[PDB]
Amino acid sequence: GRKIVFFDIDGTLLDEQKQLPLSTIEAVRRLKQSGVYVAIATGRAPFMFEHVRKQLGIDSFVSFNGQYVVFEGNVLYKQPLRREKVRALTEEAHKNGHPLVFMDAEKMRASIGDHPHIHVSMASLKFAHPPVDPLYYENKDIYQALLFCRAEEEEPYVRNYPEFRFVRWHDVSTDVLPAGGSKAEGIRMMIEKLGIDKKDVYAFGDGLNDIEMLSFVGTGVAMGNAHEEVKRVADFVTKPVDKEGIWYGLKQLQLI
Amino acid sequence: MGRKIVFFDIDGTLLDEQKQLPLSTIEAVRRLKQSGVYVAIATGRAPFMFEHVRKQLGIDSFVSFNGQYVVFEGNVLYKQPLRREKVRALTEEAHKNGHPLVFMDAEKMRASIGDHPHIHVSMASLKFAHPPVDPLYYENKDIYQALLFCRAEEEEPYVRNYPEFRFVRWHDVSTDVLPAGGSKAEGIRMMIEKLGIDKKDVYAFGDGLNDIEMLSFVGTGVAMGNAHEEVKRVADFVTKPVDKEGIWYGLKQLQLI
């Protein structure tokens, strides 16, 4: 049976400077000549890690935490937020003067231009203010949204949108995610198409968000400085991304 | 009267020593665009080698492939493919010596030989995996630049037998193949010719020796605080280092902001 390895980006493929380690390129190389399938599973939107994909030559991935899965350049599965609900959120956010940013598989758009909260938070990500397009969600598959408001203001949103999940990543911005879906469900879908079995699947992750994944695959690998709760569910704890963790880990697991 | 445009090299100019994008550079670019000033990147890289940076700064105008592929606001403005005829000869002759090549266009990259050790090494340094293999990619696709893998001791012949190309070394086992006459300053020349922008309204920020021609050519060349002195020599103004709000400060001084 063929083996496949899923990698997440942050703290896994990319180090803390957002750079790709030389040893990782080697790891992926050896991994490919050994016949081991290589893919990515992340919460990130496709257009947010296109550079990593281009660098490693990976065209199969689970993105948007499983809400958008691509197999060898083609869309295998896609579950965007319900149009109705995105609209309601937009209108409600508008009423409160809170801006939103809509994310589809290719780009993102703001409901309000030149807004202070978007500038600051997006800049913390090293991104410019997204182009403005208040009705972008109308004829597009919106997989995620960013609600720009303070924690002391989210209450109503959380309350009125139980079908959504909110995960704050900045003082003035929080991710608006779909309640259903997961990377494991995304991985499950791909191995089925690939004819692979859970036991033959490996996964490297670094954040709280990778637990579900590391738990579902046959061999979950946690990075050296990953959160304690990430290591707990891991079948193996490797060195940090900073210290050839991906390479060392793959070696110990005898994949390369 | 007319429009102004500012060109930026990538490493050392937009990105600091750690490949990090300064917060004030994001503000800088924002302010320039707001004022109607065109912002573009000028580099020897392939479009796909700096798309992330472009998306980060919302820059969709640029001079890539050392002038052979120029885009303005998302649309190709000028493009000069390598002469297919000569690309074929170079490939065959080089193949005879066991030297592989890599063919590059705006979307992707292809290698003439698979699992070759010089490709792995020189390319890993660019943080890229070995390109997929396709010995005849240039035959049906426009190539804007190529890579020849051989050491400096072996280039003489190629240099000599192919005066229609320019071999510029950047690694121990790999050198760039551009068309003779091509350079990013040259690409900057038609970008502004086509846009109808007077040289006196063209600005550029550079840091390395490959930025010298560009810097001396434009109306106002700006060298970064820690730039090589030969770069500062041709600069009309030297700004602070990249990690000291160099770009923001410079643009402020030049009163573009």
Side-chain angles (χ1 to χ4, degrees):
Chain A
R2 308 240 80 182
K3 295 182 178 176
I4 180 178
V5 184
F6 286 99
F7 295 104
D8 200 317
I9 291 74
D10 294 319
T12 304
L13 281 179
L14 305 176
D15 58 31
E16 271 98 57
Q17 275 57 59
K18 282 290 178 294
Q19 288 310 105
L20 184 59
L22 249 42
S23 54
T24 297
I25 295 180
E26 243 303 291
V28 177
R29 166 195 173 179
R30 298 300 167 188
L31 220 45
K32 281 184 174 183
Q33 71 175 56
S34 300
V36 178
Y37 206 95
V38 175
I40 292 177
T42 188
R44 289 196 181 187
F47 63 94
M48 290 291 69
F49 66 98
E50 184 285 325
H51 60 286
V52 183
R53 252 185 280 134
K54 193 70 174 186
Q55 281 172 281
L56 296 170
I58 293 175
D59 65 315
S60 287
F61 54 85
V62 173
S63 65
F64 278 129
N65 270 330
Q67 292 304 68
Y68 194 74
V69 191
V70 171
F71 182 56
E72 314 198 311
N74 295 300
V75 175
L76 174 60
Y77 170 77
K78 69 171 195 169
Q79 186 62 72
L81 275 22
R82 280 190 294 138
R83 181 215 71 213
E84 188 198 310
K85 290 299 169 182
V86 182
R87 179 179 310 109
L89 181 60
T90 305
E91 307 188 310
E92 201 177 312
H94 171 268
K95 194 136 300 181
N96 291 300
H98 295 135
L100 288 181
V101 163
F102 313 103
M103 296 182 105
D104 68 1
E106 296 141 57
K107 55 177 121 65
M108 56 188 149
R109 292 288 184 271
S111 68
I112 297 174
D114 191 34
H115 190 291
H117 293 347
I118 298 190
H119 287 293
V120 181
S121 64
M122 293 307 289
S124 76
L125 252 42
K126 300 302 182 56
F127 269 79
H129 190 304
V132 63
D133 191 334
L135 296 170
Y136 189 78
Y137 68 87
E138 275 182 349
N139 311 75
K140 293 286 184 172
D141 289 308
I142 305 314
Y143 296 95
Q144 190 178 315
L146 296 200
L147 174 62
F148 297 80
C149 77
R150 295 216 161 69
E152 320 96 36
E153 304 177 288
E154 44 189 47
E155 0 158 61
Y157 295 113
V158 175
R159 183 189 316 144
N160 299 304
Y161 296 96
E163 52 275 286
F164 288 163
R165 284 297 178 287
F166 303 67
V167 180
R168 180 160 299 280
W169 59 274
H170 185 278
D171 279 4
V172 297
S173 189
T174 177
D175 290 306
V176 181
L177 316 163
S182 64
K183 285 176 300 318
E185 184 48 38
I187 291 176
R188 196 229 73 197
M189 295 192 179
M190 188 161 280
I191 60 185
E192 184 179 307
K193 169 81 173 191
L194 227 40
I196 294 183
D197 190 289
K198 293 185 191 178
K199 63 180 181 188
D200 294 345
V201 184
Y202 299 72
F204 289 67
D206 180 58
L208 266 2
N209 185 50
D210 296 316
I211 291 175
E212 63 140 314
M213 178 180 84
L214 258 44
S215 179
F216 171 89
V217 300
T219 314
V221 187
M223 300 301 296
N225 301 315
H227 183 272
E228 289 305 303
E229 294 313 322
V230 178
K231 300 175 176 179
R232 192 194 297 284
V233 310
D235 294 296
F236 182 93
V237 170
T238 192
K239 300 180 177 180
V241 64
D242 181 64
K243 300 190 175 62
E244 306 197 320
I246 293 292
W247 168 271
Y248 174 93
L250 291 172
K251 210 181 182 187
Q252 297 300 310
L253 291 176
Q254 298 179 352
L255 281 175
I256 68 177
Chain B
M1 276 191 73
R3 288 264 192 173
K4 294 157 186 169
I5 184 168
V6 184
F7 286 91
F8 297 97
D9 180 47
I10 303 167
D11 293 334
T13 305
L14 288 176
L15 303 180
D16 60 27
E17 199 181 305
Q18 285 60 55
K19 266 56 174 175
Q20 300 299 299
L21 180 62
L23 259 33
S24 64
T25 291
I26 289 182
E27 237 318 84
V29 171
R30 164 186 169 274
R31 289 295 301 280
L32 288 182
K33 282 154 142 284
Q34 201 172 61
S35 288
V37 177
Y38 289 140
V39 177
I41 287 176
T43 182
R45 303 182 183 186
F48 65 85
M49 277 173 64
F50 68 102
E51 189 185 314
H52 183 60
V53 199
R54 291 209 302 285
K55 281 192 277 193
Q56 277 176 283
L57 293 174
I59 293 174
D60 65 349
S61 296
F62 55 85
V63 170
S64 66
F65 284 128
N66 299 89
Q68 276 50 76
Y69 191 71
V70 186
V71 180
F72 175 66
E73 302 194 318
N75 305 305
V76 178
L77 193 98
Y78 170 87
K79 49 182 174 58
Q80 188 198 317
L82 252 32
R83 292 173 53 185
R84 191 177 54 170
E85 176 206 313
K86 293 300 174 183
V87 172
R88 186 181 307 104
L90 213 187
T91 307
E92 280 167 48
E93 179 171 344
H95 176 293
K96 300 183 189 303
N97 297 313
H99 300 129
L101 292 64
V102 163
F103 313 111
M104 309 164 73
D105 68 6
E107 288 65 48
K108 65 181 79 68
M109 198 178 234
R110 291 296 180 264
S112 59
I113 303 177
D115 186 38
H116 184 285
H118 285 340
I119 296 192
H120 287 288
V121 167
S122 69
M123 299 290 348
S125 66
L126 259 32
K127 294 309 180 64
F128 273 89
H130 194 294
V133 189
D134 182 349
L136 302 177
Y137 189 78
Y138 66 98
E139 297 278 34
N140 29 59
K141 284 298 188 60
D142 276 339
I143 300 307
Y144 298 102
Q145 187 169 300
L147 291 166
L148 176 64
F149 299 81
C150 78
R151 296 171 180 288
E153 303 68 60
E154 314 168 290
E155 61 187 54
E156 171 67 307
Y158 300 115
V159 175
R160 222 84 282 162
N161 302 324
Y162 296 90
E164 32 277 300
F165 292 143
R166 169 73 54 262
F167 302 77
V168 184
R169 188 162 292 283
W170 58 278
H171 187 272
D172 278 355
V173 299
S174 186
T175 182
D176 291 312
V177 181
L178 343 182
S183 81
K184 66 179 182 178
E186 187 56 26
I188 286 177
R189 187 167 111 305
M190 7 222 11
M191 161 107 272
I192 69 178
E193 255 173 42
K194 302 297 198 305
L195 296 182
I197 296 185
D198 291 349
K199 186 177 297 178
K200 63 165 187 179
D201 298 299
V202 183
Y203 300 76
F205 285 65
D207 169 72
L209 306 171
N210 66 349
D211 294 311
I212 287 174
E213 179 193 40
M214 162 176 87
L215 243 54
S216 63
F217 170 72
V218 303
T220 302
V222 184
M224 309 291 287
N226 297 326
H228 187 285
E229 295 181 318
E230 285 301 336
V231 177
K232 302 199 176 187
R233 185 211 293 250
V234 300
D236 297 282
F237 174 90
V238 182
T239 190
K240 303 181 187 177
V242 63
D243 63 313
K244 295 298 176 178
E245 310 202 326
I247 288 180
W248 170 268
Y249 180 77
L251 290 168
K252 205 79 186 305
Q253 231 54 52
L254 297 176
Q255 302 192 303
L256 278 177
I257 293 183

